[PDB]
Here is the input.
Amino acid sequence: EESRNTTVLDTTTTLQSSGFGRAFFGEAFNDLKTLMRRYQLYGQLLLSVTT
Amino acid sequence: MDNPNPGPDGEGEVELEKDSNVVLTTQRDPSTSIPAPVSVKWSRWTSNDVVDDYATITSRWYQIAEFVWSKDDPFDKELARLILPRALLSSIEANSDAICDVPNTIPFKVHAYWRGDMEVRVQINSN
Here is the structure.
């Protein structure tokens, strides 16, 4: 299976979750739908009149 | 008030400052100056490794500078620009031996990152 997880050999302790930058930057970046709503350049063209 | 009675023990009161196995005494009251309030621990944010302060060895005092201050030194005169987390190590390396030889600085040899406060006592022995 893909996301199966047999034996987690964890050496780590607990890391404090920032809330995807909510704790530092005042905004969460977990939802990737709201990053998609920043405007990206779609196209770029020079107006070429033929006829 | 104002009853001087020295004896064989001396006159004044001696204050202490005990650490792990280092006691260093001053007759005079310190002129404390604290440039910032005490820092929070901050291993929660950037470390999953096992974090431990070695307070039985690291919190001891250690001499990192001694210098003669003569009258030949003029008015605007540096005497020691100590870079203090470095000067604890460079004093030991100035004693011509390694960092692992001193109990205060063996976790600097092992560990990679450090965050902590530093007490500094600049004692003088003027007349």
